[PDB]
């Protein structure tokens, strides 16, 4: 959990994103939250990979907010 400004979440469900802008993931994956884009979407990334993109807030259980 290196960066103090990042947030932290766990995927609640599989998320199949429609485009390259969305980051798809599977239930139970940990996600590093980078920013909250609006009321419905985070941008995040998966630790130890190059996966990054947006996904709905309703698909993740938030441990710590991004700053």
């Amino acid at each position: 959990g290196i960066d103090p400004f990042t947030g932290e979440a766990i995927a609640k469900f599989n998320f199949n994103g429609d485009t390259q802008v969305e980051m798809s993931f599977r239930k139970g994956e940990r996600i590093t939250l980078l920013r909250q884009v609006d009321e419905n979407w985070y941008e995040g990334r998966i630790p130890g990979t190059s996966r990054q993109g947006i996904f709905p807030i309703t698909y993740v259980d938030v441990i710590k907010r991004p700053l």
Partner: peptide, 10 residues
Amino acid sequence: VPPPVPPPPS
């Protein structure tokens, strides 16, 4: 059940 996916950000 996974919730419906909302419209992307504006």
